[PDB]
Design a protein around this ligand. Sequence first.
Ligand SMILES: CC(C)CCC[C@@H](C)[C@H]1CC[C@H]2[C@@H]3CC=C4C[C@@H](O)CC[C@]4(C)[C@H]3CC[C@]12C
Ligand SMILES: CC(C)CCC[C@@H](C)[C@H]1CC[C@H]2[C@@H]3CC=C4C[C@@H](O)CC[C@]4(C)[C@H]3CC[C@]12C
Ligand SMILES: CC(C)CCC[C@@H](C)[C@H]1CC[C@H]2[C@@H]3CC=C4C[C@@H](O)CC[C@]4(C)[C@H]3CC[C@]12C
Ligand SMILES: Nc1nc(NCCc2ccc(O)cc2)nc2nc(-c3ccco3)nn12
Ligand code: NA
Length: 392
Amino acid sequence: DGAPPIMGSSVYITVELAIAVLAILGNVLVCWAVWLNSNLQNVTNYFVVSLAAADIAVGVLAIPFAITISTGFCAACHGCLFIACFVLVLTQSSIFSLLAIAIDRYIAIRIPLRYNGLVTGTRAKGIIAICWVLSFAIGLTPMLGWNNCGQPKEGKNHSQGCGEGQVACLFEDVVPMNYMVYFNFFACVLVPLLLMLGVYLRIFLAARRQLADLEDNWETLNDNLKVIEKADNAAQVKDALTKMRAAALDAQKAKDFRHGFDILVGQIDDALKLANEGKVKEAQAAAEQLKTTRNAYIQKYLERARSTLQKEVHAAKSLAIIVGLFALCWLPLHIINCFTFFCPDCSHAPLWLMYLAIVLSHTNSVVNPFIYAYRIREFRQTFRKIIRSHVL
Ligand SMILES: CC(C)CCC[C@@H](C)[C@H]1CC[C@H]2[C@@H]3CC=C4C[C@@H](O)CC[C@]4(C)[C@H]3CC[C@]12C
Ligand SMILES: CC(C)CCC[C@@H](C)[C@H]1CC[C@H]2[C@@H]3CC=C4C[C@@H](O)CC[C@]4(C)[C@H]3CC[C@]12C
Ligand SMILES: CC(C)CCC[C@@H](C)[C@H]1CC[C@H]2[C@@H]3CC=C4C[C@@H](O)CC[C@]4(C)[C@H]3CC[C@]12C
Ligand SMILES: Nc1nc(NCCc2ccc(O)cc2)nc2nc(-c3ccco3)nn12
Ligand code: NA
């Protein structure tokens, strides 16, 4: 007695197939958008496409494999291992793509003038190819001998009636838990996720430091202007102009734009030469000209630089959400494996919970297209064009 297994199995399979359809459709849309729209064709989005391709493969291959292995069918043990482990190749490829995106955005905010000479489409393609090769080697490592094929469950294999060399193909019977916990979870998943967390933290800190510096230079200009306006001594004017000048050079370091800071620094130097030669009123008078240069050029370039940095912060937040949802969808299965491995006195997690955790991991292959659509205008607008035109 006990409910016929096919009833629970029918629910599981139906849900897996629903997820597969949505993973394929949404991620084909991502790839189509990058293909269509040259504004989306940049290095960051080559990693986005590599990630979308891994999620298409979850729907086309990993989900049919998961349905197959849920039956415990008789198979040659190394064929069984390939079906069991292929999803780990795809999840490792996703991890590498996510890590590359984070580093890409970190380079872009740290050394933006060197970014385009360092990070090229050709180098990115080589990186993607290497990461896919490494992904196959890591995810299929059990097929090199780190497996339980030498210790078959002969009770299961006779009750199912399997032949010679065949095992009942069940994940936990063939894939060792020490591989899943120490090698896959700790070294290959958790360590990269923590590195990604640290990279994103460094991105937000760099942005916050650059914004504060911008602001410091701005009020250094304005404060020292007031000093000159309230001064009554040549060297109180000269000293303020001197500090205004370094602030201006630092702002310029950090063509029409050049004309702005040239008028500004030229005007400072004019007022300085008057200051040195004792003419305080001529110096103060020359220094009030700076205000129209400030209003006409310097404020406009402060504003553009602030909004560029605010755009990069908003973009990095969007990409970090992707990483967060990856962790939220995969950590339950890893944590369950930790209980199975480290607590032999604990009852095994129940079968319904195992399959809920499996389904949750697969749902990760559905969500990224929705993030892009809600958070990234250029994707959203291109999705809209594709749907309205080629679908409506
Ligand atoms: C989509 C196309 C391009 C490639 C798909 C190939 C897949 C379906 C092939 C490649 C290797 C194959 C496996 C190789 C060995 C075995 C062991 C046997 O006892 C049962 C079948 C099984 C488990 C095969 C199932 C089908 C399989 C997984
Ligand atoms: C990352 C977020 C979503 C947290 C998810 C935590 C989940 C995976 C945790 C919270 C409570 C945990 C359960 C607590 C108690 C037991 C009983 C034990 O005999 C087997 C493990 C099992 C069944 C745990 C499995 C993992 C578990 C379900
Ligand atoms: C969230 C990320 C950053 C860290 C993940 C922490 C994981 C590794 C932690 C959280 C809860 C922990 C489990 C809590 C309780 C037990 C029961 C004990 O008898 C064996 C260890 C075991 C099973 C722990 C293993 C490690 C564990 C799963
Ligand atoms: N532990 C585990 N089991 C399964 N499937 C088998 C579930 C099960 C567990 C016990 C049992 O007697 C019958 C079925 N798939 C699994 N996939 C993973 C996985 C992928 C990434 C991290 O863990 N872990 N994992
Ligand atoms: Na993925």
